[PDB]
Ligand binder design. Sequence first.
Ligand SMILES: Cc1nn(C)cc1S(=O)(=O)NC(=O)c1ccc(-n2ccc(OCC(C)(C)C(F)(F)F)n2)nc1N1C[C@@H](C)CC1(C)C
Ligand SMILES: CC(C)(CO)c1cc2cc(NC(=O)C3(c4ccc5c(c4)OC(F)(F)O5)CC3)c(F)cc2n1C[C@@H](O)CO
Ligand SMILES: Nc1ncnc2c1ncn2[C@@H]1O[C@H](COP(=O)(O)OP(=O)(O)OP(=O)(O)O)[C@@H](O)[C@H]1O
Ligand SMILES: Nc1ncnc2c1ncn2[C@@H]1O[C@H](COP(=O)(O)OP(=O)(O)OP(=O)(O)O)[C@@H](O)[C@H]1O
Ligand SMILES: CC(C)(C)c1cc(C(C)(C)C)c(NC(=O)c2c[nH]c3ccccc3c2=O)cc1O
Ligand SMILES: CC(C)CCC[C@@H](C)[C@H]1CC[C@H]2[C@@H]3CC=C4C[C@@H](O)CC[C@]4(C)[C@H]3CC[C@]12C
Ligand SMILES: CCCCCCCCCCCC
Ligand SMILES: [Mg+2]
Ligand SMILES: [Mg+2]
Length: 1162
Amino acid sequence: MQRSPLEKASVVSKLFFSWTRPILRKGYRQRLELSDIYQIPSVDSADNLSEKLEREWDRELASKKNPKLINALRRCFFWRFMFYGIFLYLGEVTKAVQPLLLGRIIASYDPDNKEERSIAIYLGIGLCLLFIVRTLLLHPAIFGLHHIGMQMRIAMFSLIYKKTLKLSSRVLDKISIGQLVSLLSNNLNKFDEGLALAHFVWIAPLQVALLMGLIWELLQASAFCGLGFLIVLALFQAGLGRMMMKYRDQRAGKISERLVITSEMIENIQSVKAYCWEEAMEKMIENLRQTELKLTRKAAYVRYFNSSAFFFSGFFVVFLSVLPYALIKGIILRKIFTTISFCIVLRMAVTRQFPWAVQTWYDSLGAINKIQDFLQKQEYKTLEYNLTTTEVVMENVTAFWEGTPVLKDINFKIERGQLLAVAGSTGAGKTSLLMVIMGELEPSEGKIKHSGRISFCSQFSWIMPGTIKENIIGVSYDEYRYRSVIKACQLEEDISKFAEKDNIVLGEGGITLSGGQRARISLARAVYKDADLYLLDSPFGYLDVLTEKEIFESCVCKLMANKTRILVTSKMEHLKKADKILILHEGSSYFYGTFSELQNLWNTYLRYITVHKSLIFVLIWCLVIFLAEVAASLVVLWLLGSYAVIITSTSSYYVFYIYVGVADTLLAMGFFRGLPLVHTLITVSKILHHKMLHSVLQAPMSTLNTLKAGGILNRFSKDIAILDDLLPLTIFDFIQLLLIVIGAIAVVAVLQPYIFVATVPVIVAFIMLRAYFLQTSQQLKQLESEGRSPIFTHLVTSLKGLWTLRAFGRQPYFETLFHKALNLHTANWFLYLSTLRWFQMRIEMIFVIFFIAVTFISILTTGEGEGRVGIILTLAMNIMSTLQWAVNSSIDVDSLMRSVSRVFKFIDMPTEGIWPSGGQMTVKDLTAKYTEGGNAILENISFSISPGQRVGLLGRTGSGKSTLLSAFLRLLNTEGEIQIDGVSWDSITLQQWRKAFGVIPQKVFIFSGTFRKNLDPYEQWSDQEIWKVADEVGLRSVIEQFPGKLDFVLVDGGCVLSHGHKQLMCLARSVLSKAKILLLDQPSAHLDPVTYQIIRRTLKQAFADCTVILCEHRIEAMLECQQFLVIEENKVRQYDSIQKLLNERSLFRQAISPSDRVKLFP
Ligand SMILES: Cc1nn(C)cc1S(=O)(=O)NC(=O)c1ccc(-n2ccc(OCC(C)(C)C(F)(F)F)n2)nc1N1C[C@@H](C)CC1(C)C
Ligand SMILES: CC(C)(CO)c1cc2cc(NC(=O)C3(c4ccc5c(c4)OC(F)(F)O5)CC3)c(F)cc2n1C[C@@H](O)CO
Ligand SMILES: Nc1ncnc2c1ncn2[C@@H]1O[C@H](COP(=O)(O)OP(=O)(O)OP(=O)(O)O)[C@@H](O)[C@H]1O
Ligand SMILES: Nc1ncnc2c1ncn2[C@@H]1O[C@H](COP(=O)(O)OP(=O)(O)OP(=O)(O)O)[C@@H](O)[C@H]1O
Ligand SMILES: CC(C)(C)c1cc(C(C)(C)C)c(NC(=O)c2c[nH]c3ccccc3c2=O)cc1O
Ligand SMILES: CC(C)CCC[C@@H](C)[C@H]1CC[C@H]2[C@@H]3CC=C4C[C@@H](O)CC[C@]4(C)[C@H]3CC[C@]12C
Ligand SMILES: CCCCCCCCCCCC
Ligand SMILES: [Mg+2]
Ligand SMILES: [Mg+2]
């Protein structure tokens, strides 16, 4: 990693941006290697910028009664902002006085203008120095303003993230992931470049005042007829600005709603494929896209009229200011041309630079105001204590999640070292009681007293990205303690089977790990941490009886025999070792005491154009009208080769100069060509998104596991927004400029076939430099686009584990990890702007040297009369002033076309592509593996199932019970044959095979939507049928407690529901879509014994005969099975009776609960 070459560059080197030479010469030959990227300058590191802004923002909250974020920003950047403003202003004044020097030089070709001929050589020298000063004064000032805008964005992004970790739990309900992503993505590039346009709010009015005086000198009182037209045009554009912003505000809410739904369905794409819900998911996104595209089109029509206003004023402001003057007294051709030159600069300031500057202030101040509101939300109240009486106590505590209280009159007292066991039915408030103790649920009544040290283990196991060892140890590594908790948590057997022991890298969310393996990593993390109080929220959910027995008798009873701890349990064996017993029932304390007293009872462009058939026809239509206007202009112009206009023989060359000055209005695209072009370019974006979303759902699971959450969110938010807003109008601007250059050249090249010869050397010089620069610019843009992903990936994972983050105190670690993501994007983005500034500065210096040669050639060639060389050469250089604008606009088109190629890569991803009368199956030599180069988890598996019977799957956690179920649906690489009632595996299409199954996934899927929409996304059942099923699974009381019965919206993945309520929701789905063969993957994970009767009755009534393959861990669930399959060391054994199964195993028979042993062994 080399140091930045900017920090030791000489004064002249910084001026010409010469320090970018090493990378431009290397990127032209080879691909940019990882060592070519330089380190960022020390001034713009995220650590130093965040501290500077934080110091000023805290001064506002204490000094001023009315804090404003814009005052803190003003106190850090105002003087540098104004320093570059004055140099930018002097570069624009130089542009307005150019016609004073160039206008008199053009007059020296006329032999009548004897006064201009005597001093022509001095005007040429001054003109050359004027060009050089303007070049050296604009570009360094524009780069400095880009630098300031980058620093402001980095400082403010870090403040948002630091505030996020401190948000209260009540205000988290009102904030989704889609709001934060839209807040950051919209400003990721627009904010930096906005500061270069901000100064024209006061530069444009000063340019108008200067230019109006010079035009007054020529046309005494007729000049104001041109000002009255431009004032009316300025009011018109101001009105279109407010009309466009109204449509943009109505569109923001729908984009955030689409982003959250898109993120949810891709995170659990395996559950979507098992249910065969791809078509239903596409329909929901299609309806959201359609509503927001109508607002996008309406904003596009308004923005077209705002953009073409420049081209449609070039003739009507010149004509209106000259016509009253010519009618009273004849005007010569010399004055007509000079007025045209001054009006070009005037139209640019009024119709282009000023409305763009006003719009930037609306966007910038709007975002800073939006950020300030977020920075003032309610914060989490960390009620830490340094010390206590070493005992925990609650007194008459009542809490509300908002007409029923969650808890009421809950009181206990646990001394140091005692064990408290919390028990109760589903939804009784066991998890809420632990939230109250930690302080994430503030009680309305009562009080809490205990020490500030605490450790937590939730039902939902959160796995941070990184190594397994890094998950457990935290910050401080201890060799002795680490090896003890691993052995006590029974993780040694699983770790030894991994490719590289405990050094394997876990993805975000821990997808590659088993259901029960994640629970042990979460538990090992809690016991490794030293604390005074330990909270365990049902950690024995996805564990078999043998592993559960070993952990309970060696981890929580041996290692922590002297530490007070609270555990949630439903087993009656865990209640005997507890000193205190607490029973909960619907928020009220059912019992409190002890157990003893209880026992008393390029190809990219071509593909983009041809994706929509209607885009070709509009482009041909624009070409035919263009040829008709050029032909019309040629006939008129050829016809011209006291009066209102005075023209002489030696002054007739002004006709061509006037034509070139008004060609931008004769060739302007009217609304018959502008609106269809803009309308059709948005339909292309609609088609591309439909394909992109479609190909992601059909991709094979092996491909989808490589992608990251931030990688998908980068393409669906930033790349789609580019194709909707920026590209349609950038293309229109580029096409408009290209037509003007061709039309002006073609007309004058046939009437004077020497302008074309003299304009060749300038054209090829621009094209050769463009090809050289695009070799390296395209690679830096690609690296910058992919550098946004780590920013989005870290933002997603920090919200999913916010509660665990604050409990373990790892906030500083996550802030430092966020700054590395900011610095990685800064390196690529800063290097991209530097080379872009080099190109635009060289494209202007190349224009200058040619003009310097032309000016001196014309003056020396002009002899005693006329002088034709100068007339031709100076005309050609006037055309190249517009070609310079067209070349720079082509770079913007190419930069935005990088998003089109990134979308095309997601589209080209490979695809994975009464029969069951009885439902009997046959498996022959099935071999299953996740990666083709990985180990075979199962191998040579073979068994048969008779129709109507139930099969029980058994085995230790991590043995491969879920792998066998995934192999039936072909969710991984398989090498065998499965036969269902006669048909063959291979012959069937992959879509009819999956429809024969009913599935209950181990990980439940609830998306943001209505209760009825979650139970039935295809809308194929009436509400009478839905309620009938809802009674059989006991969900009626759950739905009625909400304001909308079957209408309530389940936001944030159904966070309103408890853990046991989600299991019943998945059982309802399987009953509704009644199929023959069922694959139930542990449907009673955390259900208490009383609630399990609901699963038991459903299994015998709803699934009358069927072919049920259970995958349960509880012994009670195996009394309803006729056949058994045991998975051990990658092999499947088969048994006919449960009593035979336990006879062979000696250790597993002892772990059986005595309550279950009597019925298992009568
Ligand atoms: C080497 C090198 N390679 N790369 C990638 C960067 C570098 S460089 O930064 O060292 N220099 C150059 O980049 C460089 C510097 C100046 C110029 N100039 C062109 C006209 C001109 O007159 C200046 C003028 C008299 C108008 C005045 F002074 F008045 F303005 N100067 N051209 C330069 N280029 C080198 C080639 C890459 C292509 C080319 C010809 C455009
Ligand atoms: C002196 C006085 C006339 C009033 O005492 C004044 C100065 C001033 C400066 C800024 N902003 C800036 O100096 C910066 C800036 C921020 C945001 C940007 C950006 C530049 O340019 C953008 F448009 F891109 O957005 C560099 C930080 C402002 F906002 C309002 C200001 N006012 C009016 C006053 O009422 C403000 O309280
Ligand atoms: N964020 C929330 N907003 C509103 N109600 C909630 C919220 N979280 C939980 N509830 C409700 O509070 C009650 C108790 O919550 P819950 O976590 O606490 O039960 P539990 O004892 O953990 O049961 P389980 O065995 O399913 O884990 C339920 O009726 C549940 O729907
Ligand atoms: N996507 C994956 N890629 C690679 N290995 C995986 C993947 N998913 C699981 N494994 C590994 O395969 C083995 C078996 O996985 P697992 O689902 O299949 O078993 P299980 O019997 O369902 O466990 P549990 O009772 O915890 O649910 C484990 O070692 C696990 O880490
Ligand atoms: C009738 C005919 C010849 C097809 C026609 C008509 C117009 C109107 C009537 C809208 C002026 C226009 N005008 C336009 O397209 C205009 C486009 N952009 C503008 C921007 C600012 C101010 C005016 C216009 C404008 O008139 C063009 C035409 O070709
Ligand atoms: C940037 C701004 C403040 C610069 C100064 C703006 C004003 C004061 C300048 C700009 C152009 C100037 C005019 C240019 C030409 C003439 C013609 C001359 O026969 C009388 C003075 C007169 C009419 C000038 C008056 C002052 C003037 C209107
Ligand atoms: C350099 C430009 C400073 C003034 C720009 C506008 C100031 C913000 C006004 C806020 C609303 C009254
Ligand atoms: Mg719970
Ligand atoms: Mg499993």
